[PDB]
Amino acid sequence: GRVRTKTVKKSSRQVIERYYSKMTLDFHTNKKILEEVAIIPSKRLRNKIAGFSTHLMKRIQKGPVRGISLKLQE
Amino acid sequence: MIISEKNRREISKYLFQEGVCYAKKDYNLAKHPLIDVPNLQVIKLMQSFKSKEYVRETFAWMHYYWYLTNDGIEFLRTYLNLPSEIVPATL
Amino acid sequence: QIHKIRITLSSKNVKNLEKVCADLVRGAKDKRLRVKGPVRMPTKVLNITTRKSPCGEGTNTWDRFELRVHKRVIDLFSSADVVKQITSITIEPGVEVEVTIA
Amino acid sequence: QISKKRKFVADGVFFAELNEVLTRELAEDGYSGVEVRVTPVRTEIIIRATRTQNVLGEKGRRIRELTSVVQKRFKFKENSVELYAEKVNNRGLCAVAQAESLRYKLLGGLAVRRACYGVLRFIMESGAKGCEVIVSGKLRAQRAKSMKFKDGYMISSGQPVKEYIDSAVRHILMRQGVLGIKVKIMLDWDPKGKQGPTTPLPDLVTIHSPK
Amino acid sequence: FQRGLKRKPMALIKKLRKAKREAPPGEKPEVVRTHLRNMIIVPEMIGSVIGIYNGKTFNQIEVKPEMISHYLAEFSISYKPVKHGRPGIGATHS
Amino acid sequence: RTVKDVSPHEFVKAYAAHLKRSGKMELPEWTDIVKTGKLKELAPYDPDWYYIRAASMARKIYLRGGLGVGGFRRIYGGNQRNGSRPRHFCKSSGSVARNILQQLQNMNIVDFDPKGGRRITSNGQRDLDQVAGRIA
Amino acid sequence: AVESVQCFGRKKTAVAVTHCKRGRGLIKINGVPIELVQPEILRYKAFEPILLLGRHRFAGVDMRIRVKGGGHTSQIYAIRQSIAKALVAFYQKYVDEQQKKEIKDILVRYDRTLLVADPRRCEPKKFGGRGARARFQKSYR
Amino acid sequence: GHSNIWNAHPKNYGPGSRTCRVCGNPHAIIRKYGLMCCRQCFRSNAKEIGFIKYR
RNA sequence: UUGACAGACUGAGAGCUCUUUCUUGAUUCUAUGGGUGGUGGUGCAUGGCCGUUCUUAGUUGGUGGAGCGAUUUGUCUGGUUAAUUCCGUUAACGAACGAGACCUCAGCCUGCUAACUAGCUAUGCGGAGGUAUCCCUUCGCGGCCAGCUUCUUAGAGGGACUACGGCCUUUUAGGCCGCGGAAGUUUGAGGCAAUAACAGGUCUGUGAUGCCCUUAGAUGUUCUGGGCCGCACGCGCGCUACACUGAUGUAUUCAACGAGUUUAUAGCCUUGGCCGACAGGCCCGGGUAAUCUUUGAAAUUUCAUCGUGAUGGGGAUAGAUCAUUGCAAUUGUUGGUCUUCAACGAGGAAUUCCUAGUAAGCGCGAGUCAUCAGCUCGCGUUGACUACGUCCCUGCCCUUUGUACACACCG
Ligand SMILES: [K+]
Ligand SMILES: [K+]
Ligand SMILES: [K+]
Ligand SMILES: [K+]
Ligand SMILES: [K+]
Ligand SMILES: [K+]
Ligand SMILES: [K+]
Ligand SMILES: [K+]
Ligand SMILES: [Mg+2]
Ligand SMILES: [Mg+2]
Ligand SMILES: [Mg+2]
Ligand SMILES: [Mg+2]
Ligand SMILES: [Mg+2]
Ligand SMILES: [Mg+2]
Ligand SMILES: [Mg+2]
Ligand SMILES: [Mg+2]
Ligand SMILES: [Mg+2]
Ligand SMILES: [Mg+2]
Ligand SMILES: [Mg+2]
Ligand SMILES: [Mg+2]
Ligand SMILES: [Mg+2]
Ligand SMILES: [Mg+2]
Ligand SMILES: [Mg+2]
Ligand SMILES: [Zn+2]
């Protein structure tokens, strides 16, 4: 199966919380943003976190997501 | 162990002159690499010195390493009749 | 007073080997010399497979031991004195330098 | 004039033999390790130890003797191989030094529990992320047993073990047998690389603070 | 023979010659005992009385014309032929 | 039309026939008594096996001009059965290859290569090309 | 300026390279006509890129193919893949993209392996058995 | 013993002519690349020699 | 106190010992303590190492909650995952190991860097063929000032993240299918791998080790020879077969992982030439290596002979004889030639491994190696059937439940 681990989930949540302004819905742009604003030891981990962040952004566009606190939403 | 006087003199001279001496654990080796004397005679003479504390012995990877001490230096000087000024090259 | 100087570099550390190659290349370039290479030979992989157990009991498990040797070739069209001066630069441990003619 | 394979294998064998010889000779003097550097017509051997005074001896007599014996045994050309003695930085972060210290304490009659706890505390206060000490053998009875002391972080699987973990094993020849001591120290990330690996843990992600 | 015999086979042949010479007329030569199991029988050795070591004892033989070009080991068996007794415990039910 | 443009089997047959018709070959007296290699169990079935082997070898030298007796032994070798033991590669007879090479050199089809082995001569190239063309 | 392309097909360890340039429409492998490729049974696989497109499309290009590695079947598969890729590249770089797309589509509709290399490779064997998965026979008594 | 007898047996080949350079045992000697080390000693000293386990 | 000529003794040019008597000089001999060595016992005294429990997902603190306490919660009803992986529920909150991450190999890059120890392209020359000048096809050699890096090598990077579309699922975690894509089982295969344990193996790997035994007529060491292989019998892992989907004899031509010298006349891998039927021998030489062996396999493909006959299947057994290694080949070391031509006609109860470049067939390199591979570790070549489900058998993980078990049901 493909279940994101606690590390990926936490990293994506924190990245979205801290840099929601620059986030986009495109995986490549999100991964570039992650490379810019974070230190990820592994490229595979970076891609996984970027994909999960894109998914979380897609959900946020629909509406509130539990576990993520956005200043503008609040 | 029976050792010829010339062989003993050569071993003592080399030991005093160099301050250290190694030997592979090969009893049947015809000649010591650094001394013309047989390896067995060299090893047994060094063991005799170590028994009475004239030398410090170390063993590792099938090899003997012998380092002269102060008592060994005094004994070698007295036995070789060398002047007190002459000392092993190590110092 | 121009000769094809052959430089052979051998090491177990790819990073150190590549850094030394780059330093030699930049040193040669700074002198307006002609540099050919580095030519990277196929990696030599010394392999030893030995049984893990020190005795004959248990499932026969084996340890695959590999020692990789990396070789590089650099050719310079210059004189012995200048190539010697270039090679005089500091070289980290684990890298073996050999300089010859042809 | 030998092939590269044999040359490199011989270099490794020489390094291992020199390491073993130095350990055997400087057991009591303290021997953190050895490093071999090869330069044109010159080879340097650096002995990392906690007590360089003993290694050098009076006026370098012991180190000169070691250099001479090493050269004679390893066929090195006269005045071509030379030995240096160097202090070990943060000796508490070296398992070999800590293992030797524990061996000395146990041989001195000190209680195993007290010695292991002292070693653990010294390692932790020296800046180690975590540490573990294992003492195995006949302790207090004819039946052998194992004593484990642990404190702090520790990893045991994956590649990061090879760089973040520094481990040592030693034997103590007691009156009634042999006591095996294992020391395992987990280092901490060091950007400079002097005191720890210059690489972060694979599963460590840091997010820069937004402006 | 091309590679050449060492000193021991030559000594054995000389001893056999001496025994044959000292043998009284019309009588067999004395026993010559040896460990050389790899010795090759040559025609000159015909009629000699040889004890061949088999690892425990010197088996006695007399050299015959038909045994030339053979090893002395071939006529001094080093093992006792096997005569089988009843199987012991653990021979079956494996 | 050259050798490369014709089937190897047909060219081998045609060149063996041409070599036999030429009459310059001097078959050794033992051609009817020896196997083609220690790995074989029986002698070649075809009486013209010597001419066929000569034609095949000549084609091989025409294609590559650096082959030797050992190379031909390897080329014409194969698996050897060892009864109850597994099979392994085995070399073929070297005397046959040496004699065939000597005969071809005598006929001037090949010559010694400066780097070692044998090389096809211009006359050999011409003869092989004509045989290939006439195959049709 | 010479008008040519070079495209490689792969199958296991077999590598084939097709050099395709302007010409009268000949096709040769290692200097031998493609019609004589061995084994004779695999001539259909060898010619498939040719049977699908027709000889007229090849009538204006000379193709020289050099192969190495692998085995008898792998070399032929690499040969056909290299032929297809070389023709597609030549049409792309000297012929209208419309015709290039048409030939690519017809080739892919028949077989995708004609342009995409098969990634299968031999699995390393593990100790405790003769094969990658096969283990030594187990006995309990 | 007598010089011509004591240790007079040739030792130019075979297991008896080779021993581990570390422990001196004559069994399981790894002669590849000139290591001349028994398997146990080599497994103990592989890291120091420079042999790494990748698979 | 050592050594030794000759004779005897001895398996023996071991002065081992005796006869005969020469040489050497405090190095030894004798006795008492103390050592030393031992593949000598003890793995049920131990260290280290390895195997197994156990390939599964499991394991444990701090502060809180419950209980008088052993203990318990955290570590869970449910959904989901390969996963104690996550989503959530929640007297638990925060954490630390294991898992994952990680590292190695393979799979894609016509994009970057660089290749006379790798190649391609075109040109110049030359050979052969075709109309023989010019033109076309195919080969051989040079261009460090012909160009280039597609093919080969190896460094840096890119690339896959279920990214995108449709359904199901709690607006979650996620799952199935699908286009595209080199790759959509964690992309494939490995390395590493927690707590706690076994009286599991190893004292015969170690100058690792306690205790016990022996220590000069030795359980030390060495030499000679034999044995470890001995053959009414039972068992395990395997090799060769029972044949025509084949054997034999031609012709034909496609790999990869690797390994290689003391140069002495020469030692390791060996090219080429000559001799020979083969086995092998001799002579020039190359390679300390992408430079030379390496121009480097078989199964397979093709054409003939064989024709259902234990037959040209099968190659056990045995005779004669010839070479190579080795100081030594007999109890055949191994390798050749001819000859002999056993069981075996597909195998009972039982029982092993295996889900894709996998099983199976085919061969090749390395370890052992003076000479021996039917073995082990790797490599590639041709290349499938079936399933993609279950707990029926054998076991494993969690929960509930019973216990008179705790040496724990082999109770
Ligand atoms: K143990
Ligand atoms: K608690
Ligand atoms: K013991
Ligand atoms: K051993
Ligand atoms: K079940
Ligand atoms: K479970
Ligand atoms: K009940
Ligand atoms: K209970
Ligand atoms: Mg971990
Ligand atoms: Mg893991
Ligand atoms: Mg013994
Ligand atoms: Mg045990
Ligand atoms: Mg509590
Ligand atoms: Mg609990
Ligand atoms: Mg390229
Ligand atoms: Mg036990
Ligand atoms: Mg046995
Ligand atoms: Mg087995
Ligand atoms: Mg080939
Ligand atoms: Mg028959
Ligand atoms: Mg047959
Ligand atoms: Mg089973
Ligand atoms: Mg074996
Ligand atoms: Zn060893």
Query: How many Å apart are CA G49 and CA G46, to the nearest integer?
Result: 7
Cβ-contact A34, A46 below 8 angstroms: yes
**Tokens standing for B19?**
């301050």
**Tokens standing for F99?**
């004699």
Cβ-contact C80, C71 below 8 angstroms: no
**Tokens standing for G23?**
């010409």
Contact B58 D21 (CB under 8 A): yes
Contact D13 H37 (CB under 8 A): yes
The CA distance from D114 to the nearest CA of chain H, in Å, is 31
What is the residue-wise DSSP string for G58-78? HTTEEEEEEEESS-HHHHHHH
Domain encompassing residue H42: 6-55
Among residues H29, H3, D25, the alpha carbon closest in space to that of B40 is found at: H3
Q: Which nucleotides of I are covered by protein (CB under 7 A)?
A: 2, 4, 11-16, 25-28, 39, 45-52, 80-83, 85-88, 96-108, 110, 114-117, 120-122, 127-130, 137-140, 144-145, 150-156, 158-164, 171-175, 182-183, 186-197, 199-202, 205-210, 222-227, 230-241, 248-263, 270-280, 288-290, 294-305, 314-316, 326-331, 335-338, 352-360, 362-364, 366-371, 373-383
Query: Please, is E84 exposed, middle or buried when counting C-beta atoms within 10 Å of its C-beta (0-12, 13-18, 19+)?
Result: exposed
**Tokens standing for B89?**
């090259």
Among residues A42, A39, A13, the alpha carbon closest in space to that of D207 is found at: A39
Closest-CA residue of F relative to G35 is F5
Residues 145-164 of D with CB under 7 A from strand I: 146, 148, 153-161
Query: How many Å apart are CA H55 and CA H51, to the nearest integer?
Result: 12
Residues 73-92 of C with CB under 7 A from strand I: 73, 75
Whether H55 is covered by a domain: the verdict is yes
Distance of CA D47 to the CA centre of its chain: 11
Query: How many Å apart are CA E5 and CA F29, to the nearest integer?
Result: 41
Give, as residue ranges, everything with CB less than 5 Å from ion ligand 24. Answer: H 20, 22-23, 38, 41
**Tokens standing for A74?**
């609040």
Q: To which H or E segment does residue B66 belong? A: strand B63-68
| Beta strand D33-39 pairing with D42-49 | antiparallel
Query: How many Å apart are CA D63 and CA D60, to the nearest integer?
Result: 5
Among residues D97, D88, D78, D75, the alpha carbon closest in space to that of D17 is found at: D75
Is D75 an interface residue toward A (CB < 8 Å)? no
User: Which of D4, D12, D35 is the closest to C44 by Cβ?
Assistant: D4
**Tokens standing for D120?**
């653990």
Among residues F47, F56, F72, the alpha carbon closest in space to that of F12 is found at: F56
**Tokens standing for E53?**
């070591």
Task: Please calculate the CA angle D111-D112-D115 and round it to the nearest 5 degrees.
Answer: 85
Helix A6-18, helix A27-37: angle, nearest 10: 80
Q: How far is CA C63 from CA C53, C66, D118, D161, in A?
A: 10, 10, 37, 18
Cis amide linkage into residue F47, ω under 30° from 0: no
Distance of CA D42 to the CA centre of its chain: 26
Instruction: Residue count of chain E, please give it.
Output: 94
Start-to-end C-alpha separation, chain D: 62
What dihedral do alpha carbons C92, C98, C102, D4 form, nearest 10°? -110
Query: How many Å apart are CA F96 and CA F37, to the nearest integer?
Result: 9
Query: How many Å apart are CA F133 and CA F2, to the nearest integer?
Result: 6
Cβ-contact G18, G86 below 8 angstroms: yes
Whether H1 is covered by a domain: the verdict is no
Cβ-contact D164, D186 below 8 angstroms: yes
Q: What residues does D42 pair with on adjacent strands? A: D39
Among residues E66, E64, E1, E2, the alpha carbon closest in space to that of E38 is found at: E1
Distance of CA D153 to the CA centre of its chain: 20
Distance in Å from I384's C1' to F71's CA comes to: 36
Instruction: Residue count of chain C, please give it.
Output: 102
Q: E31 in helix, strand or coil? A: strand
Query: How many Å apart are CA H42 and CA C41, to the nearest integer?
Result: 28
Cβ-contact E40, E4 below 8 angstroms: no
What is the residue-wise DSSP string for chain D? ---HHHHHHHHHHHHHHHHHHHHHHTTTT---EEEEEEETTEEEEEEEES-HHHHH-GGGHHHHHHHHHHHHHTTPPTTTEEEEEEEPTTGGG-HHHHHHHHHHHHHTT--HHHHHHHHHHHHHHTT-SEEEEEEEEE-SSSSEEEEEEEEE----SSTTHHHHEEEEEEEEEETTEEEEEEEEEE----SSSSSS-SS--TT--EEPPP-
**Tokens standing for E92?**
């079956």
Nucleotide nearest to D7 (CA to C1'): I288
Rg (CA), chain A: 12
Number of neighbours of residue D79 by Cβ within 10 angstroms: 10
Whether H17 is covered by a domain: the verdict is yes
Contact G32 F5 (CB under 8 A): yes
Residues 1-60 of E with CB under 7 A from strand I: 3, 6-8, 11, 15, 33-38, 53-56
Cβ-contact B38, B6 below 8 angstroms: no
Cβ-contact C90, C97 below 8 angstroms: no
User: Which of H33, H34, H48 is the closest to D16 by Cβ?
Assistant: H48
Query: Please, is B54 exposed, middle or buried when counting C-beta atoms within 10 Å of its C-beta (0-12, 13-18, 19+)?
Result: buried
How far does residue G96's CA lie from ligand 24's centre (Å)?
72
Distance of CA D208 to the CA centre of its chain: 37
Cβ-contact G18, G6 below 8 angstroms: yes
Is G136 an interface residue toward C (CB < 8 Å)? no
Q: Which ligand neighbours the alpha carbon of G8 most closely?
A: 15
Question: Does the nearest atom of strand I lie within 7 Å of F14's Cβ?
Answer: no
How far does residue D158's CA lie from ligand 10's centre (Å)?
6
CB contact residues (below 8 A), chain D span 183-202, against chain A: 199-202
Among residues C97, C96, C44, the alpha carbon closest in space to that of C68 is found at: C44
**Tokens standing for E90?**
């653990």
* Residue environment code for D149-163, b if the CB has 16+ CB neighbours within 10 A, otherwise e: beeeebeeeeebeee
Q: To which H or E segment does residue C36 belong? A: strand C34-40
Nucleotide nearest to G17 (CA to C1'): I151
Cβ-contact D172, D105 below 8 angstroms: no
Cβ-contact C10, C96 below 8 angstroms: yes
Task: Please count the CA atoms within 13 angstroms of the CA of E14 that sit on its side-chain side.
Answer: 6
Resolution for the entry shown, Å: 2.2
Question: Does the nearest atom of strand I lie within 7 Å of A3's Cβ?
Answer: yes
Task: Please calculate the CA angle E32-E36-E40 and round it to the nearest 5 degrees.
Answer: 95
Whether H44 is covered by a domain: the verdict is yes
Question: Does the nearest atom of strand I lie within 7 Å of E79's Cβ?
Answer: yes
Q: C68 in helix, strand or coil? A: strand
Whether H25 is covered by a domain: the verdict is yes
Whether H30 is covered by a domain: the verdict is yes
Query: How many Å apart are CA B90 and CA B68, to the nearest integer?
Result: 10
Contact H49 D9 (CB under 8 A): yes
**Tokens standing for F16?**
């063996």
Count of domains for chain H: 1
**Tokens standing for F42?**
């029986």
Number of neighbours of residue G83 by Cβ within 10 angstroms: 28
**Tokens standing for A72?**
């503008």
Contact D38 C93 (CB under 8 A): yes
Distance in Å from I5's C1' to E15's CA comes to: 22
Question: Does the nearest atom of strand I lie within 7 Å of F34's Cβ?
Answer: yes
How far does residue B24's CA lie from ligand 7's centre (Å)?
76
Helices (DSSP H) in chain F: which residue ranges?
8-22, 49-63, 69-76, 94-107, 122-135
Is A11 an interface residue toward D (CB < 8 Å)? yes
Query: Please, is E24 exposed, middle or buried when counting C-beta atoms within 10 Å of its C-beta (0-12, 13-18, 19+)?
Result: exposed
**Tokens standing for F53?**
């082997």
D84 phi and psi angles, rounded to 5 deg: -120, 155
The CA distance from D204 to the nearest CA of chain A, in Å, is 7
Cβ-contact E21, E36 below 8 angstroms: no
Query: How many Å apart are CA B54 and CA B79, to the nearest integer?
Result: 13
Cβ-contact G12, G120 below 8 angstroms: yes
> Computed from CA positions of residues D134, D135, D137, D140, in that sequence, does the dihedral angle turn out positive or negative?
negative
Query: Please, is D40 exposed, middle or buried when counting C-beta atoms within 10 Å of its C-beta (0-12, 13-18, 19+)?
Result: exposed
| Beta strand C3-11 pairing with G32-33 | unpaired
Break chain E down into helix, strand, coil percent, rounded to 5: 30, 15, 55
Chain position carrying tokens 């690489």: D199
**Where does A5-61 show beta strands of DSSP type E?**
38-39
The CA distance from H42 to the nearest CA of chain D, in Å, is 10
Cβ-contact G94, G32 below 8 angstroms: no
Helix A27-37, helix A43-62: angle, nearest 10: 120
The protein residue nearest nucleotide I299, judged by CA to C1', is: F79
Query: How many Å apart are CA H50 and CA D14, to the nearest integer?
Result: 11
**Tokens standing for D41?**
């017509």
Cβ-contact F43, F35 below 8 angstroms: yes
Among residues D94, D93, D79, the alpha carbon closest in space to that of D33 is found at: D94
Whether H29 is covered by a domain: the verdict is yes
CB pairs under 8 A between B and H: 9
What is the residue-wise DSSP string for F106-125? HHTSEEE-TTSSEEE-HHHH
Nucleotide nearest to C70 (CA to C1'): I154
